[PDB]
Amino acid sequence: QAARLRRRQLIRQLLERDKTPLAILFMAAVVGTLVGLAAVAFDKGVAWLQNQRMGALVHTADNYPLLLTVAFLCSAVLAMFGYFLVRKYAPEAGGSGIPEIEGALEDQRPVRWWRVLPVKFFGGLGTLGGGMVLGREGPTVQIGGNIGRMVLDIFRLKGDEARHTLLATGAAAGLAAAFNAPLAGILFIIEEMRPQFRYTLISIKAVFIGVIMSTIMYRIFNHEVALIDVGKLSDAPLNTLWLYLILGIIFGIFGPIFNKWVLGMQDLLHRVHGGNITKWVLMGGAIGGLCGLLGFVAPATSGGGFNLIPIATAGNFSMGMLVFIFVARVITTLLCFSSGAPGGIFAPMLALGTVLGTAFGMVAVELFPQYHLEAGTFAIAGMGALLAASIRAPLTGIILVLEMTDNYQLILPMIITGLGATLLAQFTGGKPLYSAILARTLAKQEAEQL
Amino acid sequence: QAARLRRRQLIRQLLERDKTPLAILFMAAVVGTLVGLAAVAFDKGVAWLQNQRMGALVHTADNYPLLLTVAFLCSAVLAMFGYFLVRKYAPEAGGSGIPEIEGALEDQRPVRWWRVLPVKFFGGLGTLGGGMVLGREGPTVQIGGNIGRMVLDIFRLKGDEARHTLLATGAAAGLAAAFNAPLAGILFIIEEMRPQFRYTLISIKAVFIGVIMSTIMYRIFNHEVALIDVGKLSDAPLNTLWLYLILGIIFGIFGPIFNKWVLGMQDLLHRVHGGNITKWVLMGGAIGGLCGLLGFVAPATSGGGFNLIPIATAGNFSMGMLVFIFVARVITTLLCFSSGAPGGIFAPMLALGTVLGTAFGMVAVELFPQYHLEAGTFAIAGMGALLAASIRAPLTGIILVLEMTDNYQLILPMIITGLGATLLAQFTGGKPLYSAILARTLAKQEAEQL
């Protein structure tokens, strides 16, 4: 009966497949409407502190000394307000938010919306609005997971089913509304987010419904908008593909290395505030300010990244400038994330990738003039190549780019790259940056209950 | 230690995540090169029997009586040769091939490439080349799974890991090269194909490598080609979205109903050959011929579907003609699939969807002239809407369309439809057509070992 019994199960299971209680759906449908209706508010707000912080630089646009200082001041002030809410009211909403919600799907590091919501919301609203090199996924994904179980508790639903689900959708609807990438939002909650070592109980269809409602919300407000807009680029002939493997490899070897820095520098930053709820808040206002300053002198180095970059570059920067920008951001990016302020490195890793990808093309363009190349295609190929080597979630990367870049012509080179970026990132022993961070924020949670 | 032990595991697991033995990869890399190099050969061949079967209709293009008969004759002959190889040498390669490979991932209905390969290959090469309303995924996906374990056995690899994997990739690389849809190929092997009631042991990254190599093969041969080509259509403003829900609902209620027919008519077809390895082969040559005839008089009703349809329609058919075509194909489609000849209903369900979707638009166009609508967008919305309600695998449907239609502008309406197509397809109690077929081909395998 070992073999002949499985059948009696499957057949009862197959013909019973796709089980989703109408309440989990109608509910995920709500998590989406809110998680999304949240990001639109968050976003439009972070975009307002940038409008104001930029409005004060034309009021005093007479003398550079004052200007170059109010700049540093506004960002430093906001970064403060930020690191504060995090350090005092909920040290959980510091950093990204994915590695955390990602744990909550394994049932650990529970979710306390009652705090994290208004914290992460205003905290990040501070850091991002400051003009720091932080992406806005972290906040939305977390605020999302939270807006998730918040409604799980307000309507008190039972089972692991409705718990794991209503959370995941809040997260997908999160990432989705952060980039207006519904497809990328979903594929994320099932290649990354979700618990990876044992069957899950998340209902895809519930996630879907979430993602849509969230995406609809984004469309409702941000009418006729595209975060990144590059036209259509050249095509990528077969006799060119290999070049994208080479690039994938480079992203591969670099991917892990970057992790060591991002990961190992949130240490060489803990040895400057030691946990001091203020020395920390001051250190933050410091780098936060540094950004506001860079925001005026050489903006290529500050900013949430794509705020102009993937575009201004997928077309025309001097080889050197690229290199500068790359390194410049490599720092500022770590500096802001590693410190521990609200906001993720998802976005800024898109920028870095785009810049590094461009640079590669730059070179390939002049070495094989027999190919008639446009550096751009290499910028798009390597846009999510860093995600692929660092947080190691290619599919979500590939679809996410295609989602907001719209050049399916390059779908092949895009994979060829991102795929080799996960290989050379394994044979060099790297780790899913988002997990390696859970491990840390978990093993250092274990040796603290003794 | 209940709670505090899980941690000691995860942390050992997290930091150990992404385990893939270099041999499984290098191997999947081979399954892809072959599974793909197989479809290109299969395809180009099925396209040749259509060139020849069409070459004989210009040799005798004088008199309609002879013409209208050699037409029926060639198809009837080929369909014969087809149902034969299936009935005599391997009754496993009859029907699609997905419900079967889909079982092999649960470990049942084992795979015997030594037979099924040359059978499904030439068998379908017969049926499809005949011009029957059968898609070419079935054959490739199966021939793929088979080319899969074939190399698992030729190189004899161990574990459930390398078995489940090398199979799945052969399948993904299958679907992938069948539509030149790498992304759809992958998302399929993880929303459908794969065992759904317990953690799997398939290595995504292995699948990836397969899909690519397969897709590269397709590009290697079919240079500058697109199976379906519709330009860019109008955009889909917010004040229009709901219309696509309505459509999703309709696809929802219809989805299951169709299943009952496809499913319940492979019965009202068994009562005409009773298992007779010849009455069957004759019944086949019959409907197979019927197609060759329709292939000349009203082609909208025969053919693998998109062979002109999703295009000639995503633009201009009379409301009625659509209706005709819809019903006409509804039959011919079942008739060919249900009979039990090699070839799937994946493709033909795209056609039906496109026709039904068009029809919906047709109507919506003239009812809300306040919207400035193009029926087309509704054709694309509902292209994979049948897949969504019938085989109930939306994500694979949505990406598959976008993959070969290239209108991301409609990504929202595409989901809004396909999503509502799985809801109204649950609240009406339908089942994953691909599973319901495994159940059947499994429970009738159990009551045959007594």
CSV table of C-alpha atoms in Angstrom, one decimal, chain A residues 65-344:
chain,number,residue,atom,x,y,z
A,65,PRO,CA,27.8,79.1,1.3
A,66,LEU,CA,24.3,79.4,2.8
A,67,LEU,CA,22.7,77.3,0.0
A,68,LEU,CA,25.3,74.4,0.4
A,69,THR,CA,24.4,74.5,4.1
A,70,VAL,CA,20.6,74.7,4.3
A,71,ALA,CA,20.9,71.7,1.9
A,72,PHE,CA,22.9,69.7,4.4
A,73,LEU,CA,20.6,71.0,7.2
A,74,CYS,CA,17.2,69.9,5.9
A,75,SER,CA,18.4,66.4,5.1
A,76,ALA,CA,20.3,66.1,8.4
A,77,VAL,CA,17.1,67.2,10.2
A,78,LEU,CA,14.9,64.8,8.4
A,79,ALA,CA,17.3,61.9,8.7
A,80,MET,CA,17.3,62.7,12.4
A,81,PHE,CA,13.5,62.5,12.8
A,82,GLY,CA,14.0,59.3,10.9
A,83,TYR,CA,16.6,57.3,12.8
A,84,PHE,CA,14.7,58.5,15.9
A,85,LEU,CA,11.2,56.9,15.3
A,86,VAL,CA,13.1,53.7,14.5
A,87,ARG,CA,15.5,53.7,17.5
A,88,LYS,CA,12.9,54.7,20.1
A,89,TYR,CA,9.5,53.3,19.0
A,90,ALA,CA,10.3,50.2,16.9
A,91,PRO,CA,13.9,49.2,16.0
A,92,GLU,CA,12.3,46.6,13.7
A,93,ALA,CA,11.4,49.1,11.0
A,94,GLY,CA,15.1,49.9,10.5
A,95,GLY,CA,16.9,48.8,7.4
A,96,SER,CA,14.9,47.2,4.6
A,97,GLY,CA,11.8,45.4,5.9
A,98,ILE,CA,11.9,42.5,3.5
A,99,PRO,CA,14.3,40.3,5.6
A,100,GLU,CA,11.9,40.9,8.4
A,101,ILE,CA,8.5,40.3,6.7
A,102,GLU,CA,10.4,37.4,5.1
A,103,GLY,CA,10.9,36.0,8.6
A,104,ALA,CA,7.3,36.6,9.6
A,105,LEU,CA,6.4,34.0,6.9
A,106,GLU,CA,8.5,31.4,8.8
A,107,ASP,CA,6.9,32.6,12.1
A,108,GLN,CA,9.5,34.5,14.0
A,109,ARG,CA,10.3,38.2,14.5
A,110,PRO,CA,6.5,38.8,14.7
A,111,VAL,CA,4.7,41.7,13.1
A,112,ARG,CA,3.5,44.6,15.2
A,113,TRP,CA,1.7,47.0,12.9
A,114,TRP,CA,0.4,49.0,15.9
A,115,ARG,CA,4.0,50.5,16.0
A,116,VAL,CA,5.9,49.7,12.8
A,117,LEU,CA,3.2,51.1,10.6
A,118,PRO,CA,3.3,54.8,11.6
A,119,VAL,CA,7.0,54.4,12.3
A,120,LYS,CA,8.2,53.0,9.0
A,121,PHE,CA,5.8,55.3,7.3
A,122,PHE,CA,7.0,58.6,8.8
A,123,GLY,CA,10.5,57.3,9.5
A,124,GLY,CA,11.2,56.5,5.9
A,125,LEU,CA,9.1,59.4,4.8
A,126,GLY,CA,11.9,61.2,6.6
A,127,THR,CA,14.9,59.3,5.2
A,128,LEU,CA,13.7,59.1,1.6
A,129,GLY,CA,12.3,62.6,1.7
A,130,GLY,CA,15.7,63.6,2.9
A,131,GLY,CA,17.2,62.4,-0.4
A,132,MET,CA,19.2,59.5,0.9
A,133,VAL,CA,20.3,56.7,-1.3
A,134,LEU,CA,17.5,54.4,-0.1
A,135,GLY,CA,14.9,52.7,-2.1
A,136,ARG,CA,11.2,52.9,-1.3
A,137,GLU,CA,10.4,49.1,-1.5
A,138,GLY,CA,11.6,48.4,2.1
A,139,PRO,CA,9.0,50.7,3.6
A,140,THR,CA,6.1,49.7,1.3
A,141,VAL,CA,6.8,46.0,1.5
A,142,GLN,CA,6.9,46.1,5.3
A,143,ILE,CA,4.2,48.7,5.8
A,144,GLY,CA,2.5,46.3,3.5
A,145,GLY,CA,3.0,43.1,5.4
A,146,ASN,CA,1.9,45.0,8.5
A,147,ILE,CA,-1.2,46.5,6.8
A,148,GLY,CA,-1.5,42.8,6.1
A,149,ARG,CA,-1.9,41.1,9.4
A,150,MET,CA,-3.4,44.4,10.8
A,151,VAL,CA,-6.5,43.4,8.9
A,152,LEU,CA,-5.9,39.8,9.8
A,153,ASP,CA,-6.4,40.9,13.5
A,154,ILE,CA,-9.1,43.5,12.9
A,155,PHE,CA,-11.3,40.8,11.4
A,156,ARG,CA,-9.6,38.0,13.3
A,157,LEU,CA,-9.2,35.2,10.8
A,158,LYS,CA,-7.9,31.7,11.6
A,159,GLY,CA,-5.5,29.1,10.3
A,160,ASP,CA,-2.0,29.3,9.0
A,161,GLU,CA,-3.6,29.6,5.6
A,162,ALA,CA,-5.2,33.0,6.2
A,163,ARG,CA,-2.2,34.2,8.2
A,164,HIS,CA,0.7,33.4,5.8
A,165,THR,CA,-1.5,34.5,2.9
A,166,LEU,CA,-2.9,37.9,4.1
A,167,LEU,CA,0.7,38.7,5.0
A,168,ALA,CA,2.3,37.8,1.7
A,169,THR,CA,-0.2,39.7,-0.4
A,170,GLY,CA,0.3,42.7,1.8
A,171,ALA,CA,4.0,42.3,0.8
A,172,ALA,CA,3.4,41.7,-2.9
A,173,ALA,CA,0.9,44.5,-3.1
A,174,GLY,CA,3.7,46.4,-1.5
A,175,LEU,CA,6.5,45.8,-4.0
A,176,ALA,CA,3.9,46.0,-6.7
A,177,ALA,CA,2.8,49.5,-5.9
A,178,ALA,CA,6.3,50.6,-5.3
A,179,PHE,CA,7.3,50.2,-9.0
A,180,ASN,CA,3.9,49.8,-10.6
A,181,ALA,CA,5.1,46.2,-11.3
A,182,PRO,CA,2.2,43.8,-10.6
A,183,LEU,CA,3.9,40.9,-12.2
A,184,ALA,CA,7.2,41.5,-10.4
A,185,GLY,CA,5.3,42.0,-7.2
A,186,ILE,CA,3.8,38.5,-7.4
A,187,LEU,CA,6.9,36.6,-8.7
A,188,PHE,CA,8.7,38.1,-5.8
A,189,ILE,CA,6.5,36.6,-3.1
A,190,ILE,CA,7.3,33.2,-4.6
A,191,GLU,CA,10.9,33.1,-5.5
A,192,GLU,CA,12.1,35.1,-2.6
A,193,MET,CA,9.9,36.3,0.2
A,194,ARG,CA,8.1,33.0,1.0
A,195,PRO,CA,9.6,30.4,3.3
A,196,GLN,CA,11.9,28.3,1.2
A,197,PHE,CA,12.6,25.1,3.0
A,198,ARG,CA,9.1,23.5,3.4
A,199,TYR,CA,5.8,23.6,1.6
A,200,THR,CA,3.9,26.9,2.2
A,201,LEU,CA,0.3,27.7,2.7
A,202,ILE,CA,0.1,30.9,0.8
A,203,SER,CA,-2.7,31.2,-1.7
A,204,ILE,CA,-1.3,32.6,-5.0
A,205,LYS,CA,-4.8,33.6,-6.1
A,206,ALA,CA,-5.1,35.7,-2.9
A,207,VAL,CA,-1.8,37.4,-3.7
A,208,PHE,CA,-2.9,38.1,-7.2
A,209,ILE,CA,-6.1,39.8,-6.0
A,210,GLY,CA,-3.9,41.9,-3.7
A,211,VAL,CA,-1.4,42.9,-6.3
A,212,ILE,CA,-4.1,44.1,-8.7
A,213,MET,CA,-6.1,46.2,-6.2
A,214,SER,CA,-2.7,47.7,-5.1
A,215,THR,CA,-1.6,48.4,-8.7
A,216,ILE,CA,-5.0,49.8,-9.5
A,217,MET,CA,-4.6,52.1,-6.6
A,218,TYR,CA,-1.2,53.3,-8.0
A,219,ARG,CA,-2.9,54.0,-11.4
A,220,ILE,CA,-5.8,55.8,-9.7
A,221,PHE,CA,-3.4,58.5,-8.5
A,222,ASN,CA,-0.2,58.5,-10.5
A,223,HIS,CA,-2.0,58.9,-13.9
A,224,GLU,CA,0.2,58.8,-17.0
A,225,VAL,CA,3.5,58.1,-15.3
A,226,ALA,CA,6.5,55.7,-15.7
A,227,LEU,CA,9.2,55.7,-13.1
A,228,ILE,CA,11.9,54.9,-15.6
A,229,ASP,CA,11.6,55.7,-19.3
A,230,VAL,CA,14.1,54.6,-21.9
A,231,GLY,CA,12.7,54.3,-25.5
A,232,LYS,CA,13.2,51.1,-27.4
A,233,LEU,CA,16.8,50.2,-27.9
A,234,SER,CA,18.6,48.3,-30.6
A,235,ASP,CA,17.9,44.6,-31.0
A,236,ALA,CA,20.3,41.9,-29.7
A,237,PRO,CA,21.4,39.5,-32.5
A,238,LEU,CA,22.5,36.0,-31.6
A,239,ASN,CA,26.2,36.8,-32.4
A,240,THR,CA,26.0,39.1,-29.5
A,241,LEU,CA,24.5,37.1,-26.7
A,242,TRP,CA,27.7,35.7,-25.2
A,243,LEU,CA,28.8,39.3,-24.4
A,244,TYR,CA,25.9,39.3,-21.9
A,245,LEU,CA,27.1,36.1,-20.3
A,246,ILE,CA,30.5,37.7,-19.7
A,247,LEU,CA,28.7,40.6,-18.1
A,248,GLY,CA,26.6,38.2,-16.0
A,249,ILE,CA,29.8,36.6,-14.8
A,250,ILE,CA,31.2,39.9,-13.7
A,251,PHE,CA,28.0,40.7,-11.9
A,252,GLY,CA,28.4,37.2,-10.5
A,253,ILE,CA,31.8,37.7,-8.9
A,254,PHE,CA,30.9,41.2,-7.6
A,255,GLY,CA,27.5,40.3,-6.2
A,256,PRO,CA,28.8,38.5,-3.1
A,257,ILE,CA,31.7,41.0,-2.5
A,258,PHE,CA,29.1,43.8,-2.4
A,259,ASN,CA,27.2,41.7,0.2
A,260,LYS,CA,30.2,41.4,2.4
A,261,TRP,CA,30.4,45.2,2.4
A,262,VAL,CA,26.7,46.0,2.9
A,263,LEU,CA,26.6,43.2,5.4
A,264,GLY,CA,30.0,43.7,7.1
A,265,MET,CA,29.7,47.5,7.2
A,266,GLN,CA,26.6,47.6,9.2
A,267,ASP,CA,29.1,46.5,11.8
A,268,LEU,CA,31.9,49.2,11.2
A,269,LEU,CA,29.0,51.5,11.9
A,270,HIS,CA,27.7,50.0,15.1
A,271,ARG,CA,31.1,50.9,16.6
A,272,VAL,CA,30.3,54.6,16.5
A,273,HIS,CA,27.0,54.8,18.4
A,274,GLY,CA,27.3,51.4,20.3
A,275,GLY,CA,23.5,51.4,20.5
A,276,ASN,CA,23.2,54.9,21.8
A,277,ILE,CA,19.7,56.0,20.8
A,278,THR,CA,21.3,59.4,20.1
A,279,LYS,CA,24.9,59.0,18.9
A,280,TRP,CA,23.0,56.8,16.4
A,281,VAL,CA,20.4,59.5,15.6
A,282,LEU,CA,23.3,62.0,15.1
A,283,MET,CA,25.4,59.6,12.9
A,284,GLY,CA,22.3,59.3,10.8
A,285,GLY,CA,21.6,63.0,10.5
A,286,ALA,CA,25.2,63.1,9.4
A,287,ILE,CA,25.2,60.8,6.4
A,288,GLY,CA,21.6,61.9,5.8
A,289,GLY,CA,22.8,65.4,5.6
A,290,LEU,CA,25.8,64.4,3.5
A,291,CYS,CA,23.3,63.3,1.0
A,292,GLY,CA,21.3,66.5,0.9
A,293,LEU,CA,24.7,68.2,0.1
A,294,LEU,CA,25.5,65.7,-2.7
A,295,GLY,CA,21.9,66.3,-3.8
A,296,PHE,CA,23.1,69.7,-4.9
A,297,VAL,CA,26.7,69.1,-5.9
A,298,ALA,CA,27.0,66.0,-8.1
A,299,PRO,CA,23.4,64.5,-7.8
A,300,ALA,CA,24.6,61.4,-9.7
A,301,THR,CA,25.9,60.2,-6.4
A,302,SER,CA,22.9,60.8,-4.1
A,303,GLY,CA,19.2,60.3,-4.7
A,304,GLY,CA,17.0,57.2,-4.6
A,305,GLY,CA,18.9,56.3,-7.8
A,306,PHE,CA,16.8,56.1,-10.9
A,307,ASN,CA,15.5,59.5,-10.0
A,308,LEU,CA,17.2,60.3,-13.3
A,309,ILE,CA,20.0,57.8,-13.6
A,310,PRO,CA,19.0,54.5,-15.5
A,311,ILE,CA,17.9,56.9,-18.1
A,312,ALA,CA,20.4,59.7,-18.3
A,313,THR,CA,22.9,56.8,-18.5
A,314,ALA,CA,21.2,54.1,-20.6
A,315,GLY,CA,22.2,56.8,-23.2
A,316,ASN,CA,25.2,59.1,-22.6
A,317,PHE,CA,27.8,59.3,-19.8
A,318,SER,CA,31.6,59.5,-20.2
A,319,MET,CA,33.2,56.1,-19.4
A,320,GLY,CA,35.0,57.8,-16.4
A,321,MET,CA,31.9,59.5,-15.1
A,322,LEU,CA,30.2,56.1,-15.0
A,323,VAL,CA,33.1,54.8,-12.9
A,324,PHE,CA,32.9,57.8,-10.6
A,325,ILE,CA,29.2,57.5,-10.2
A,326,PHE,CA,29.5,53.7,-9.6
A,327,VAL,CA,32.0,54.0,-6.8
A,328,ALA,CA,30.4,57.2,-5.4
A,329,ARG,CA,27.1,55.4,-5.1
A,330,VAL,CA,28.6,52.1,-4.0
A,331,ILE,CA,29.5,54.1,-0.8
A,332,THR,CA,26.5,56.4,-0.2
A,333,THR,CA,24.3,53.3,-0.9
A,334,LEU,CA,25.9,51.2,1.9
A,335,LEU,CA,26.4,54.1,4.1
A,336,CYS,CA,22.6,54.8,4.2
A,337,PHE,CA,21.4,51.3,4.3
A,338,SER,CA,24.0,49.8,6.6
A,339,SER,CA,23.5,52.7,9.1
A,340,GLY,CA,20.0,51.3,9.7
A,341,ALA,CA,17.6,53.9,8.4
A,342,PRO,CA,14.2,53.0,6.9
A,343,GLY,CA,14.4,52.2,3.2
A,344,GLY,CA,15.8,49.3,1.1
